[PDB]
Design a protein around this ligand. Structure first.
Ligand SMILES: *[C@@H]1O[C@H](CO)[C@@H](O[C@@H]2O[C@H](CO)[C@@H](O[C@@H]3O[C@H](CO[C@H]4O[C@H](CO)[C@@H](O)[C@H](O[C@H]5O[C@H](CO)[C@@H](O)[C@H](O)[C@@H]5O)[C@@H]4O)[C@@H](O)[C@H](O[C@H]4O[C@H](CO)[C@@H](O)[C@H](O)[C@@H]4O[C@H]4O[C@H](CO)[C@@H](O)[C@H](O)[C@@H]4O)[C@@H]3O)[C@H](O)[C@H]2NC(C)=O)[C@H](O)[C@H]1NC(C)=O
Ligand SMILES: *[C@@H]1O[C@H](CO)[C@@H](O[C@@H]2O[C@H](CO)[C@@H](O[C@@H]3O[C@H](CO[C@H]4O[C@H](CO)[C@@H](O)[C@H](O)[C@@H]4O)[C@@H](O)[C@H](O[C@H]4O[C@H](CO)[C@@H](O)[C@H](O)[C@@H]4O)[C@@H]3O)[C@H](O)[C@H]2NC(C)=O)[C@H](O)[C@H]1NC(C)=O
Ligand SMILES: *[C@@H]1O[C@H](CO)[C@@H](O[C@@H]2O[C@H](CO)[C@@H](O[C@@H]3O[C@H](CO[C@H]4O[C@H](CO)[C@@H](O)[C@H](O)[C@@H]4O)[C@@H](O)[C@H](O[C@H]4O[C@H](CO)[C@@H](O)[C@H](O)[C@@H]4O)[C@@H]3O)[C@H](O)[C@H]2NC(C)=O)[C@H](O)[C@H]1NC(C)=O
Ligand SMILES: *[C@@H]1O[C@H](CO)[C@@H](O[C@@H]2O[C@H](CO)[C@@H](O[C@@H]3O[C@H](CO)[C@@H](O)[C@H](O)[C@@H]3O)[C@H](O)[C@H]2NC(C)=O)[C@H](O)[C@H]1NC(C)=O
Ligand SMILES: NCCN1C(=O)CN=C(c2ccccc2F)c2cc(Cl)ccc21
Ligand SMILES: *[C@@H]1O[C@H](CO)[C@@H](O)[C@H](O)[C@H]1NC(C)=O
Lengths: 227, 318, 333, 105, 117
């Protein structure tokens, strides 16, 4: 049971004297907030409201030198209730009409303080992200939809977003079986949009949905043609 | 009192954040369920609501007390205070634990360290309900659940023999389906975060086709027969033949539209869609048969019912 | 300066109180005397087999710890104090998405008498589950239950009983009936015991007896269908030599039946049984289809004996079916 | 009020034999139907409460039953101390007892 | 244990009121409603009325509405029944019960012989 007490004292040491107000390496180079996504499923594509409901295992790993421990050769995974006591990126989705983190049984959320300092913070998120639908070729349309991750209050000086893994940062897209759609391709972009205040980071996950004409050819076109 | 000083001793110096035996060995968890009622299966969203009494069991060396009291039967007030396994349902579109009158949760603790945290949940789980042959599709809808963060090395879920206590299926909202039986499983799943153990409960739901048969198959088949009625109509009689033939297609179209309601937007060649399309082309074939005859009839009169019987045979096989 | 007395007593009341433990732990069972005053019997969700009900869920229980002697026998407490003292975790066994009203402030009081007889009244809108067997539709009557009992406490720690006589413990307001297609005939209660795996629990059942109001359906669906079958039978009245007229009349009959059947299904949820709409609409469907078949037979025959006999026979059959069906489902309980 | 109807007016049976005392309630009484035994010149003593639950201190031979209206009290083996009047008293509505069936040798 | 002691037998001419008590000592008096019952010779038990000792809330059977007045003395832990305008029918034996819960009358008094002549 010595390891139990060791982990207890180490976690207490880490969380003691911790300022949630200060980002990692405050007054220093930008903190490289790597990101990683795994789309569990795309629930539906609401073209009437021009948005799609997407459920994903959103994850974002960064380094915080304060949360550094070396005595235990293992990767602590503390309870999800500790996230409120740790600094977190103020990430928000620019095109997000409605979203929530699942709560059953406990609030779906993860923390994992790696020995070096890398903090693997992840949430199970459902988002009804907005997507401007140009339904002028509908049903023979190739609707392009995107998720726009971006920091709110931090500029590129203080924070920086990248896909840890050039393309592996997005996973599970292929297995998705949309009812009326086929995900022909997905791409990940890492821009630095320039706003009036300054240059903000940005990651733009994009899905180039293609309408499944096989369904609608019999649903809609076939009756009209027959008549 | 004695119970209150026991509780104060237990929670004193207790780290909610840390799991039992962290850095020593994985914390084995035994989970048993009571499926109170499987809500209606939502074919539109390929989901189904289920009401369960999810009960978890795990030893905890810290929560050991030696007294005449064999068990500390507690209400939901202590759930937050002690460590709880962060279990979540990996295919839950939306779920919530009931709160009226008070949070439906219990927490019993023994001297040896056993815990029996249980709670009531209403999961709108996701089931990959494919409709290739509909209504014919038996589905083993899962209820995968596992710790969100803790790796396989730290949390192991292990079924007990008396795990899934299915309730009275008579009062279930499982209409459109029948609960053939349950089937539990347990494997390891590899993901970007790490390795996890996934406990999936397969509910063998068998389609109840009677409602859809009387709703759709019987009337549309009667439409097909109505098509034969036009065939039996004889003599030149152009107005009557045209009236019958064209009037049939209207009701067939309305029936197809009504059948479309329950059908999701899944890009599959649904058996119901195949059936209504077969009826559609049958009526169209009858109308064009009269069209060419006006420009032979007896042969078509004989042929068409046999084709209907063959279609019904093939459909019955599926 | 009487406010000081109440402040002092109320503040010092809760010292040394352990909210986690039930009253009188380890020495007796905690008797919770419940009672319900249905403010309004909400609509019966026919499609989802559930009903809504607004209730003043009162429930009292003796507690020796909250014992005080003071000028006022009853000490009304704010909602904040209600959370700091033990309360029964009386969940609903067949509840589904229940909500406790909070506008303006939480709708719940808690009066502590001098002896310690708490009275914990609250307002709820429980959407309980009512398993409906719609086989005797639309005459179907349902005894929708409202089972409720403790969640965390077995039969040996928390036992529920009615504060008054059981017949006089579920009071329904005269104007509370919000039913649009039912009639709350009466109430019946019982206090059983449930054998769960984790232990035994006590359940306080209350069966609200409801009878479906046939007035809406008998005019929306039944009467148009009876009219249509009469129209189908009218098709026989037309002379056989007028082939097109009888053809169009016959096809119109089935078109009308299609419309009526489509309207019927949306009214009720899925049912794989021989419900009223199934039986009656199917019989009328067969009647009109038989009219079409009869006209086909007449057309091939070429007024003759056959036509007149076939015409006259059917209305007797339709009347026989109607009498049997109505007398059956009217008497069926 | 609710009227109780002790159908067996006066049963007579020798020791060591089965006898059942019926009890009919005019209206629904749920499961609130107690049974009492009144020896001559003595106050009644409870035997069965609820519908079938046996009160403490009662010999096992006493056993009840009954769902909604039909309630029966069965004595497995009548003894020399089972000779007394038996009344069934409901409490679903205001209390209303039964006539009282007499037990003899 | 619980003992329900009632007043001894009494004889009175018609029309003169009487008082009969019911003393409970085993349990705290105010907890449970005290019921009063009548049983004429060779007849069934007849409910008179019950008194809630704590708040003295009282209810009487319709036939006995105004025939018997139930009053309680929490200080003495005794329940009294006051009968007035006595007639021939009133000759009977009266017990006082004790309703433990909705099911059963736990304890019964010794029974008070009342004769009118
Ligand atoms: C972004 O905004 C959203 C809201 O817009 C925030 O979400 C809210 O966060 C608060 C704070 O955590 C939650 O409050 C908690 O509510 C618990 C019960 O909630 C139920 O009622 C509310 C209405 O009042 C419903 O909306 C809830 O349903 C919604 O949430 C659930 C998940 O919770 C979803 O599944 C649903 O679909 C709905 O979306 C629920 O029905 C309440 O019990 C809890 O209070 C306990 O916990 C706190 C924690 O500090 C304690 O302080 C407190 O004393 C209680 O602890 C006692 O009780 C627990 C019961 O388990 C015991 O375990 C303890 O031991 C102790 O005895 C808390 O008040 C709120 O529910 C939630 N959702 C809302 C408002 O819709 C997000 O947090 C916010 N931020 C982010 C990043 O999203
Ligand atoms: C606790 O936290 C630590 C620290 O984050 C993590 O340890 C990781 O463990 C995994 C084991 O699967 C390591 O994966 C392998 O690492 C090898 C060495 O990595 C070092 O060198 C590379 C060189 O490019 C650096 O990029 C890297 O940052 C390390 O410095 C790699 O060579 C391996 O490559 C291939 O391995 C197999 C071969 O078949 C393939 O299947 C793989 O996909 C991969 O292509 C592999 O990547 C990982 O490197 C470790 N991380 C670090 C930082 O060292 C664990 O999370 C955990 N460890 C514990 C508890 O011991
Ligand atoms: C669904 O719809 C979205 C719309 O948002 C599409 O997203 C666009 O995708 C394209 C192609 O991937 C993106 O174009 C990218 O632009 C980057 C920025 O270009 C500037 O780069 C530097 C600054 O870093 C400047 O100095 C320079 O002058 C450029 O102005 C490029 O870096 C990207 O890579 C390559 O771009 C071109 C060649 O294509 C060359 O400059 C280089 O070779 C460079 O390496 C890339 O071109 C665009 O930014 C995205 N956003 C938009 C349009 O808003 C999705 O592509 C679409 N779905 C699919 C499947 O395509
Ligand atoms: C639900 O899961 C449980 C376990 O995951 C299943 O119960 C397990 O069934 C196997 C099949 O025989 C048991 O194996 C045998 O157990 C006996 C008794 O322990 C042992 O003597 C034999 O050597 C053999 O190992 C296994 O024990 C049993 N699980 C436990 C904990 O005993 C159960 O069948 C599943 N439910 C289903 C499929 O419906
Ligand atoms: N029929 C008893 C079988 N059963 C269980 O075994 C699971 N547990 C409870 C239960 C849990 C806590 C308190 C009371 C309970 F009844 C329960 C609840 C319902 Cl709603 C239905 C069935 C049921
Ligand atoms: C409780 O005390 C007994 C001896 O009285 C001891 O054997 C046991 O280990 C103790 N258990 C604890 C401290 O959990």
């Amino acid at each position: 049971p010595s390891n139990m007490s060791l982990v207890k004292e180490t976690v207490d040491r880490l969380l003691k004297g911790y300022d949630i107000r200060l980002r990692p390496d405050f007054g220093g180079p930008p903190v490289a907030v790597g990101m990683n996504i795994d789309i569990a499923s795309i629930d539906m594509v609401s073209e009437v409201n021009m948005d799609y409901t997407l459920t994903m295992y959103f994850q974002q790993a960064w380094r915080d030198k304060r949360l550094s421990y070396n005595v235990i050769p293992l990767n602590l995974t503390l309870d999800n209730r500790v996230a409120d006591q740790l600094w977190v990126p103020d990430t928000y989705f620019l095109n997000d009409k409605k979203s929530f983190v699942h709560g059953v049984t406990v609030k779906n959320r993860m923390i994992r303080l790696h020995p070096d300092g890398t903090v693997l913070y992840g949430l199970r998120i459902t988002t009804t992200a907005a997507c401007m639908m140009d339904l002028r070729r509908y049903p023979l349309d190739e609707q392009n939809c995107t998720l726009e991750i971006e920091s709110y209050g931090y500029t590129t000086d203080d924070i920086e977003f990248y896909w840890r893994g050039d393309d592996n940062a997005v996973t599970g897209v292929t297995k998705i079986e949309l009812p009326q759609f086929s995900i022909v391709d997905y791409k990940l972009i890492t821009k630095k949009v320039v706003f009036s205040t300054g240059s903000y980071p940005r990651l733009s996950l994009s899905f180039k949905l293609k309408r499944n004409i096989g369904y609608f050819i019999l649903q809609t076109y076939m009756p009209s043609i027959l008549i | 009192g004695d119970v209150t000083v026991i509780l104060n001793n237990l929670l004193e110096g207790y780290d909610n954040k840390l799991r039992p035996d962290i850095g020593v060995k994985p914390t084995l968890i035994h989970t048993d369920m009571y499926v109170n009622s499987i809500g209606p299966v939502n074919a539109i969203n390929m989901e189904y609501t289920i009401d369960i009494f999810f009960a978890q069991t795990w030893y905890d060396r810290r929560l050991k007390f030696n007294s005449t009291i064999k068990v500390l039967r507690l209400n939901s007030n202590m759930v937050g205070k002690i460590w709880i396994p962060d279990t979540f349902f990996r295919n839950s579109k939306k779920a919530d634990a009931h709160w009226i009158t008070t949070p439906n949760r219990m927490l019993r603790i023994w001297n040896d360290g056993r815990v029996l945290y249980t709670l009531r949940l209403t999961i709108d789980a996701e089931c990959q309900l494919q409709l290739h042959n509909f209504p014919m599709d038996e589905h083993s809808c899962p209820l995968e659940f596992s710790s969100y963060g803790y790796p396989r090395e730290e949390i192991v879920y292990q079924w007990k023999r008396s795990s899934v206590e299915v309730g009275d299926t008579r009062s279930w909202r499982l209409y459109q389906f029948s609960f053939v039986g349950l089937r539990n499983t347990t494997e390891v799943v590899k993901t970007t975060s790490g390795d996890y153990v996934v406990m999936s409960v397969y509910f063998d739901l068998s389609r109840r086709m009677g409602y859809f048969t009387i709703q759709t198959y019987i009337p549309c088949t009667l439409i097909v027969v109505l098509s034969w009625v036009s065939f039996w109509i004889n003599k030149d009689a152009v107005p009557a033949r045209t009236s019958l033939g064209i009037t049939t297609v209207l009701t067939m179209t309305t029936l197809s539209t009504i059948a479309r309601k329950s059908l999701p937007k899944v890009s599959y060649v649904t058996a119901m869609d195949l059936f209504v399309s077969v009826c559609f082309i049958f009526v169209f074939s009858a109308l064009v048969e009269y069209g060419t005859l006006h420009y032979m009839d007896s042969y078509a009169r004989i042929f068409f019912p046999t084709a209907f019987c063959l279609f019904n045979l093939v459909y019955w096989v599926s | 300066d009487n406010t000081t007395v109440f402040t002092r007593i109320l503040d010092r009341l809760l010292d040394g109180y352990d909210n986690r433990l039930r009253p009188g732990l380890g020495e007796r069972v905690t008797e919770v005397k419940t009672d319900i005053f249905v403010t309004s019997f909400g609509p019966v969700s026919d499609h989802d087999m559930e009903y809504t009900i607004d209730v003043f869920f009162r429930q009292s229980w003796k507690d020796e710890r909250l014992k005080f002697k003071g000028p006022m026998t009853v000490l009304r407490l704010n909602n904040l104090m209600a959370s700091k003292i033990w309360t029964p975790d009386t969940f609903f066994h067949n509840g589904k998405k229940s909500v406790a009203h909070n506008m303006t402030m939480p709708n719940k009081l808690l009066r502590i008498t001098e002896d310690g007889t708490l009275l914990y009244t609250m307002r709820l809108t429980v959407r309980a589950e009512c398993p409906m067997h719609l086989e005797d539709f639309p005459m179907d009557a349902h005894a929708c239950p409202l089972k409720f009992g403790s969640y965390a406490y077995t039969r040996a720690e928390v036992v529920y009983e009615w504060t008054r006589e059981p017949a006089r413990s579920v009071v329904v307001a005269e104007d509370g009936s919000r039913l649009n297609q039912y009639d709350l005939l009466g109430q019946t209660v019982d206090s059983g015991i449930v054998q769960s795996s984790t232990g035994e629990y006590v359940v306080m059942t209350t069966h609200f007896h409801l009878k479906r109001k046939i007035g809406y359906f008998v005019i929306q669906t039944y009467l148009p269908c009876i009219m249509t079958v009469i129209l189908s039978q009218v098709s026989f009245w037309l002379n056989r030599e007028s082939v097109p007229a009888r053809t169009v009349f016959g096809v119109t009959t089935v078109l009308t039946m299609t419309t009526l059947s489509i309207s019927a299904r949306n009214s009720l949820p899925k049912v794989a049984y021989a419900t009223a709409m199934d039986w009656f609409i199917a019989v009328c469907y067969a009647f009109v289809f038989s009219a079409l078949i009869e006209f086909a037979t007449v057309n091939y025959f070429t007024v003759s004996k056959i036509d007149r006999l076939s015409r006259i026979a059917f209305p007797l059959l339709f009347g026989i079916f109607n009498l049997v069906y109505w007398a059956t489902y009217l008497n069926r309980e | 009020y609710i009227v109780m109807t002790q159908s067996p007016k006066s049963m007579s049976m020798s020791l060591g034999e089965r006898v059942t005392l019926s009890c009919r309630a005019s209206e629904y009484v749920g499961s609130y139907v107690s049974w009492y035994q009144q020896k001559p010149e003595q106050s009644p003593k409870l035997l069965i409460y609820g519908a079938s639950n046996r009160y403490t201190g009662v010999p096992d031979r006493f056993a009840g039953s009954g769902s909604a209206t039909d309630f029966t009290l069965t004595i497995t083996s009548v003894q020399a101390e089972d000779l007394a009047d038996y009344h069934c008293g409901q409490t679903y509505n205001y209390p209303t007892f039964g006539g009282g069936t007499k037990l003899e040798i | 244990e619980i003992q329900l002691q009632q007043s001894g037998p009494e004889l009175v001419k018609p029309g003169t009121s009487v008082k009969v008590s019911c003393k409970a000592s085993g349990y705290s008096f105010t907890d449970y409603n005290m019921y009063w019952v009548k049983q004429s010779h060779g007849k069934s038990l007849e409910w008179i009325g019950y008194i809630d000792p704590y708040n003295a809330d009282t209810t009487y059977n319709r036939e006995f509405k105004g025939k018997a007045t139930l009053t309680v003395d929490k200080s003495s832990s005794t329940a009294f029944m006051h009968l007035n305008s006595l007639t021939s029918e009133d000759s009977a034996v009266y017990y006082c019960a004790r309703k433990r819960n909705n099911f059963y009358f736990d304890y019964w008094g010794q029974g008070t012989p009342l004769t009118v002549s």
